[PDB]
Structures are given as C-alpha cells and as structure tokens.
Symmetry: C3
Subunit: 157 residues, 3 copies
C-alpha cells in the first residue's frame, strides 16, 4: 500500500503533521503531494513548501515529499499510489471530499479515497489561519513546526 496525501500545504502545519505521523504508522509508503495551486496565490513557492514539508517530515523513513502541478488523478498514477489520504476537520471538508472522492472514482478507479479526522488538539488548525495570524505578527509557534515558524517569521519582514 502506497498512500498519497495531497494538499497546498501553504505552509505545512501541525495539523498536517499529525495526519502524516498517523499515516506513516499505518502504511508502507507515504507520499506528500504538494500541489502547485497557482490560482490560490500561495504565500510560499512550490519549492519552499516542498522544502518545509521535507524538513518537518525527514525523521520519518517511509515518508517522502514531492511537488506537482498536474491533475491529481493523473499524478497519483505517476506515483503508483493506490490510496488517497485526506483529512476531515468539519462538515465543509466532508462535503467537498465526499464530492471529490466520487469524482476521482471516475478519473482514477483503482485508487481508494480514505479519510482521517484530526486529534482534537489540532482540529482547528488552518493554513489560512496560520498565514493570517503570522502576517499580523501573532505567535503561530503552537500550530507549526519551528522551521515553519522561522519561515513565516522571515517571510513577513
């Protein structure tokens, strides 16, 4: 089993990292697929986001980070993954993932879509929230890895 965890990860947070720790324990191979997502004007470049996700995850031997800008249903076949991993924090996540799962079932029928929910300690962590707090000088050290905090710190001065 090779699982693919796709997202924008702008930047990667302790919310993502918890899911990755749990996936790392359940599957033989975990690939973090950082989506380019140019139409979201991500705060960080694809290169940095890949780099932060690597730094935050280097300590896990069966976890890899890779960037992509193609259709997710195509990229998963290029990585030879048979499982999608997504996280569910709230009903808006569930609805969207529910629809995307039915959709990817059409585009990539041999790929399962599976979901995890967060630990209550990380259920509320948003990348949009971390970005908006850091841009106004709020402390985001409780929601991200130190390297990411350091990155946010540098990015806004």
């Amino acid at each position: 089993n090779r699982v693919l965890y796709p997202g924008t990860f702008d930047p990667i947070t302790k919310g993502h990292g918890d899911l990755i720790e749990r996936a790392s324990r359940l599957f033989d191979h975990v690939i973090i697929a950082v989506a380019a997502s140019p139409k979201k004007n991500p705060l960080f470049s694809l290169e940095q986001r890949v780099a932060l996700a690597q730094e935050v995850t280097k300590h896990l031997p069966n976890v890899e980070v890779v960037g992509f800008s193609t259709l997710l249903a195509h990229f998963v076949k290029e990585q030879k993954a048979n499982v999608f991993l997504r996280g569910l924090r709230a009903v808006s996540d569930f609805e969207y993932e529910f629809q995307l799962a039915n959709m990817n079932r059409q585009l990539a029928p041999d790929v399962e879509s599976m979901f995890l929910t967060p630990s209550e300690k990380y259920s509320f962590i948003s990348s949009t929230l971390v970005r908006e707090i850091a841009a106004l000088g709020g402390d985001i050290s409780k929601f991200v890895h130190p390297a990411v905090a350091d990155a946010l710190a540098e990015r806004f001065k």
Copy 2:
C-alpha cells in the same frame, strides 16, 4: 406555471441537465435564466453559456434559455415567472438556497421557491470541479453533454 431556473451554468453540466429534464416534465413552461455572474469570472462568456444551454435543451419544447444580468427578483417579473427552481446537492447548497429564498421572498413575494435533489448519479457533479479538471486535461466527458465537452476542450486551446 412558468418556472425559472437561474444559475451561472459555467458550463451547463449533466447535473443541471437532469434537473431541467425533470422540470420540463413537471411544468408547462421552463426558462433557463443564465446569470452574467461577473463576480465569478466565468470560464465561458454569457453568450457561449447561453448557446451551450440552448444546445443541450434543444429537444425540450417547453424549455427556453435566456441570458440576464439584472437582479434576479426583477428578471423573474420581466419573465412573468411564478416559480423559482433550484438544486440541492449538499448542506452547502441547502444553506445557501434557504437564505436566498427568504431573501427572494422579500424582493419577490409572489414567486415560489422550489427545490429538486439530483439523481445520485449526478449528485457529486460541480461546475467548478468540471472546470478545474478540464483545465488540467482530465477527462470530463462523463459529467457533461458532448457539446459541452467539446467546448471545454476548445477553451484551453
């Protein structure tokens, strides 16, 4: 009864199409009112979206297609329609249509708001999803009419 089905239809999809076939069977006159929707930066122009919706409903005699860029509560009067038709796919749709209907009740008190839910076969189909998949060269033929599929294909080349 003259029912008015307003939407952005960017582009019209098999989910829209299912609701229209079912409405045409239920009401004497069905108008598809295509909204300009400038705040949505539509992939297609209002003219193309009208042409597409008309092409897809060509075979239904009690169905007409019209473009409009005015307030919906004014346009429905200009069309002398007494019923709104809207679709409900998910809690997100339900919330929004619920708010829009109490709002249209103030602006157009003589117009009913009514809802259909999609066949499970088209429940997951989103216009936004169709657009984002076509933009990355994923096959979207199962979610749209052949003319619409061609129109997406041409739109990114």
Copy 3:
C-alpha cells in the same frame, strides 16, 4: 465589569448586525464594535466609511462605541481590555468558521471568552454580501439596512 468586543468587516453594517448590537447593549456594560480593515476582502466601503456608518446606526446607544482596526484581533481585544468576543451565528457556515476561530483565539488570548448570538428569524438571512449585490443592481434594500446605509449604497453605485 463586562466589556464585549463585536469584531467584523461591516461592509456595510446591516440590520442583522444591528439587532445583535441592540441585544448586546442591553446585556453588557460596554460594547465595542471593532471594524476590521480586512484588506484581503477588497471591501466596498473604506474603513473610515464603515466606521462612520456603524457609528450613525448606533448613536442612540450610550454604552456602545465604534472603532476601526487592522491589527490582529487577539491583540486588539487585549488592547481594548475586553473580556468577551461577540459573534453571530446565522447558519452552519458561520458555526463552523466561528468554532474554529474561537479555539484559535483561545490559544492567542486565553482570558477572552467567545460567545454567540443567533439572529431573530426576521434578520436571519441578511448578509453584507447580499445587500451589496442587490444595491449594485439597484434593488430595494431598505428592509435589510438602516436608512443612512441605504443612502450610502445608492451613492456608492452612482
């Protein structure tokens, strides 16, 4: 003893906002309307204008003040020494976003409470986004907004 801070974008302030302000003024000693600059929303009215509009609609309430701000809300509520946030819940969407924002503020401002009101069903559907879109198309929005705000929309789209 209780100083409550109601933060929002207020673009523009609405009768839905107004009901909550009315109900809160009856409930707390001091009510502060904190209007966020919200540049990331490309607001229709300027901060200066939104503040002024929010003031005109609230002048009849003595324990209510209006102030604009563009700093972090969790810093700003401390700066106002307010001990409770007021937010409104109209629908599941508000509830999710507010639930997530309250847990986040609990981390940034642990001694500030987050509390919620739900709208009277007569203002349940009123949105600033809705009022703006209707006015921009010349609809009558007088039932959703105070006369000063209605006038402000009409002129802004002319």
